[PDB]
């Protein structure tokens, strides 16, 4: 795998982690 391929995946992983933390402390999870 190349550096370019790593960077393309990096952005999507960051977005998923951010959303999960927001729903960590909510009654109704946003999905």
List CB contacts of 30: < 8 A, sequence separation 6 or more: 19, 22, 23
| Binding residues among 10-29 for RNA as defined by CB under 7 A | 12, 16, 19-20, 23, 29
* Nearer CB in complex with RNA: 3/27: 3
Among 6, 13, 25, 28, binds RNA (CB under 7 A): 6
3-state helix, strand, coil in the chain (%, to 5): 70, 0, 30
Residues of this chain that bind RNA (CB under 7 A): 3, 6, 8, 12, 16, 19-20, 23, 29-31
């Amino acid at each position: 795998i190349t550096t370019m391929q790593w960077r393309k995946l990096k952005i999507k992983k960051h977005k998923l982690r951010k959303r999960r933390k927001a729903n960590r402390m909510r009654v109704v999870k946003v999905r």
